[PDB]
Write a protein that binds this DNA or RNA. Structure first.
Ligand SMILES: [Mg+2]
Ligand SMILES: [Mg+2]
Ligand SMILES: [Mg+2]
Lengths: 115, 62, 71, 154
RNA sequence: CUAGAGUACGGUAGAGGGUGGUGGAAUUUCCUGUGUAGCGGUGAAAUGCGUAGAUAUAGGAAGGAACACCAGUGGCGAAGGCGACCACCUGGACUGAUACUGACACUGAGGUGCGAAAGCGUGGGGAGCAAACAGGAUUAGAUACCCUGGUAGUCCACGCCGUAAACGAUGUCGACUAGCCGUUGGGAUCCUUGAGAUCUUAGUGGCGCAGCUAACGCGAUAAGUCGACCGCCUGGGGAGU
């Protein structure tokens, strides 16, 4: 199966980082997470582990081609920009980088403050 | 939004354009609800830290 | 003194009742993302800054100006 | 802690004409028994020349650089969480790490005729099947599980 | 008689009220495609959720409440309070010119009103959050902090209750007393190009001389110098019982 000019989605929480390679149609091709690379704890939240899972998604994406990538970065956590430098390391032409961030204008109220 | 030409240039044009827009400190203040009295402490302490900064700099401007 | 002249962008002229129609004016006062600028950056007088914020919120309602880069 | 520490130097080996071997000789001496330890280091030097035709300095030159490591951990605690950080070993330090690992595994070799214990250690590390080489590479494997803590809370 | 007080006339500024209407971002539940092994959480874990196809990701539908940026020692209101946009009714303040009424004023025991939030009654409505509660963890012990869930409530209409660190810990009203730097709104004068200038009222801030104060500290928005009326205090517990 052959598709080109895919879209890379990056979801970065405070505890885990999930990377997914899709098409313009919004269909899953390859997903890879920080916990699947075998860190599982305080090591899980590091921006180093957002490079291990980033390239591993970039290796099952060459099953279908995808010589062009379009990056949407989403999340507050660390490894927010370290994952982009681990994309063209596999040899992918990155066209444009775009922030997507859910910001409520007023929104529902968040949980209470820790003590 | 950052388009592209080496790659290290477009990174620093993106790390900076996100911060110069915002939406990184605002996310960090969505994870605990402040009661409106505690939001009147930011309005109180920051107004003191601005009017005192206009006067402490005048000692440097002597 | 760029923050000084933009105070005179409304006070030197007799353009006191601004409208939500001159988009060539309003695009000078909107950032690249979509959010509205402060008044210590333009340096406009606070009579007009309040009057400037209404003409944004009406022009935003008529789909003449976006909100965010999402839509 | 005002920085004080100057440098003292020992470089003397007249009967062979060497410099690394004299510093290695000091890691074998116990309680100032220098003349005892001198004939054991030469006693394990000639057995290599008995074993291999090459000059046994170069066997010792090769056996250092397969026991000498590259990176190692450093448990710098943040003050509320015990972390470990893989750090680059300074080039001056990395000589003495091999020579100190080499002697301590010679003493648990468990042979007879003590100079034969150190003889077998310098033969293995030109190949890699020594216990010092196995102790070298295992600490190398500890750094990559630690590699997540390289810069971040480090 | 017109200096207090009130009226008539222009003119600005405002999250001041009440009654409807309409938005966009985000959260959740549901539907559908792709796709396949974990997600979530934490000093670290566990309870929990997962191939009976989750998280992710795209499309759609329904519904509820809050209103980023502007936004500020900034405004308005008698105080509590009040931030999306528009219509709809509707109160008061500022500022200028000018005429009129000619002391019509001040305070106020009793009495009358408006009273945050939690709570209470009948009816709606149920997104998130979350006392009570349940489980995991920590712990000599942990009902607690931390974690996963979760009900009354928070929301609306009508009625009730009347207290708060209801705070400027300072009753309302009137008159005099060196200055300087800010800021909201409004007229001035002024050479005019001003990033103008100075003066004057109505607010709202930072320093400061006399003066007062046990001291700290206030200092034309007095705790300074003086008037008019009211409320209240008399060692600590016992007891605002
Ligand atoms: Mg010291
Ligand atoms: Mg109050
Ligand atoms: Mg009181």
């Amino acid at each position: 199966k052959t598709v080109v000019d895919g879209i890379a989605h990056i979801h970065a929480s405070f505890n885990n980082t999930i990377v997914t390679i899709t098409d313009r149609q919004g269909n899953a091709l390859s997903w890879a997470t920080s916990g699947g690379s075998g860190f599982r704890g305080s090591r899980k939240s590091t921006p180093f582990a957002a490079q291990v899972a980033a390239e591993r998604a970039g290796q099952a994406a060459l099953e279908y081609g995808l010589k062009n990538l379009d990056v949407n970065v989403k999340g507050p956590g660390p490894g927010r920009e370290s994952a982009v430098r681990a994309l063209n390391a596999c040899g992918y032409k990155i066209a444009s980088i775009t922030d997507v961030t859910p910001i409520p204008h007023n929104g529902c109220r968040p949980p209470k403050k820790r003590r | 939004k950052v388009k592209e030409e080496p790659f290290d240039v477009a990174l620093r044009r993106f790390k900076r354009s996100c911060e110069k827009a915002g939406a990184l400190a605002e996310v960090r203040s969505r994870e605990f609800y402040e009661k409106p009295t505690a939001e009147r402490k930011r309005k109180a302490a920051a107004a003191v830290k601005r009017h005192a900064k206009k006067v402490q700099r005048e000692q440097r401007r002597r | 003194f760029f923050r000084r002249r933009r105070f005179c962008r409304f006070t030197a002229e007799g353009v006191k009742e601004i409208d939500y129609k001159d988009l060539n004016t309003l695009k000078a006062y909107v950032s690249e993302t979509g959010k509205i600028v402060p008044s210590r950056i333009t340096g406009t007088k606070a009579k007009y800054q309040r009057q400037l914020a209404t003409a944004i919120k009406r022009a935003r309602y008529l789909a003449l100006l976006p909100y965010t880069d999402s839509h | 802690r005002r920085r004080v520490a100057a440098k003292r130097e020992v470089l003397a080996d007249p009967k062979y004409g060497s410099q690394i071997l004299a510093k290695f000789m000091n890691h074998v001496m116990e309680s100032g028994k220098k003349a005892v330890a001198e004939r054991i280091v030469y006693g394990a030097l000639d057995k290599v020349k008995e074993r291999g035709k090459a000059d046994p300095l170069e066997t010792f030159e090769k056996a250092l650089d397969a026991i000498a490591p590259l990176v190692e951990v450093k448990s710098r605690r943040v003050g509320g969480a015990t972390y470990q950080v893989p750090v680059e070993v300074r080039p001056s330090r990395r000589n003495a790490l091999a020579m100190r690992w080499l002697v301590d595994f010679a003493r648990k070799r468990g042979e007879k005729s003590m100079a034969l214990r150190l003889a077998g250690e310098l033969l293995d590390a030109a190949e890699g099947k020594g216990a010092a080489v196995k102790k070298r590479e295992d600490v190398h494997r500890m750094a990559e599980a630690n590699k997540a803590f390289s810069h971040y809370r480090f």
